[PDB]
Amino acid sequence: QLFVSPVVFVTLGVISLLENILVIVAIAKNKNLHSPMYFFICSLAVADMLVSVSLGFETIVITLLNSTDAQSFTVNIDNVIDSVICASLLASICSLLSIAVDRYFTIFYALQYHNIMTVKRVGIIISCIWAACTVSGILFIIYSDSSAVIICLITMFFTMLALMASLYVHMFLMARLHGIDCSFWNESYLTGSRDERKKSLLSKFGMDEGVTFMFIGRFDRGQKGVDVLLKAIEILSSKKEFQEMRFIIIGKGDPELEGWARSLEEKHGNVKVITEMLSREFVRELYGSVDFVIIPSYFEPFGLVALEAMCLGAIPIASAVGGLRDIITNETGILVKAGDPGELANAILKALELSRSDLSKFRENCKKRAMSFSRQGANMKGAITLTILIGVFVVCWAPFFLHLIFYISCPQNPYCVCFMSHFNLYLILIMCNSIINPLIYALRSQELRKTFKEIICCYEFLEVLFQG
């Protein structure tokens, strides 16, 4: 068994002690941190220090009975220390998952999630988590010799591992497939008013002024859904409201589908078809000129195609599918059933009646909604903070949990025991989780860094009046 000096356990437990009370004191003393996310961080800080304090208390205890030399007092104080550690570890996971649930809802349903999660509601949830964790922690240590408990602890680590893997491929690997580029999709690249650009755009195609609906994508059957839009135009073409609408269909692909599209372009007059792929700069101008963009996709994993349109005031009419369903709300667009040309055509009729009011507030909601999905926004930065916190937890607890796997899968294997003999190294690594976590909050929260500086100045004054 690899020996580590008991001072190391007591030292790091003290550093983790002062660090985590500073975290709890700061959030409590700062009303600017009275949000559900920081409340769940506070519960993680409590479970962090309780693990490090118990481990430092355990090594101090163990050293004491190495000098006195009852067997019943050992088992009692051992089951109590280990139960506090077990309960805090379960709370450590529940708090991390609660931050994940907080981040997911603060990103896609921000206004809603803020209303249910009142300052009361966080209290019951955090208390309910610690109640179930303390109960489960005691039951786990009682049956610490059962294969069900060790497998239960192992399964909860693999879920945190799978969640960290999911967040890594989302926020880093595919950070670039669903991330909105605000440096390019900006209103500042436009000049004049909206009707100014729209009238100039409709004049470029030799067309009268009307409510403009625009489609851009690939011409295929059963994907981007241009076949649905062509059928929807044919439906509306027989109605009297068709004359007030203007349609700009852009795309290349199925030669029989554009021959369809080009046939209606020759049949009506308020329909313009462009069978080439235009530059992204022209697409940007069209987003700030047309009134609505129609995204009738059969399958759309990322709502990025919507976010770019809503950046320039374009109100999306998309299928409630994949990313479009999560991006577009009732205040920022119109959703329809995928593959339904009749349901689609009704949304253009709804958008036609909607255009008879002042849509400036609607377009401002779209710009504001798409703005909140920027990587530099507070929502994306919170999910990156959650990914750092879970990555730190997985790395710090991985050696201990591999040791747990070896304990039930190969305790006799001559080099499972070689890994198992370094158990003390995995213990101090566990306490490093409660030391790195406060540092993570500091470099990821600008407000928490400000409260930390106000305390070192009050701690510099906590010695003047102390000694004088």
Binding site: I62, I77, D82, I85, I430
Partner: peptide, 8 residues
């Protein structure tokens, strides 16, 4: 009475 649990 060991440091942590499952160390043995």
């Amino acid at each position: 009475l060991d440091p942590x649990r499952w160390g043995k």
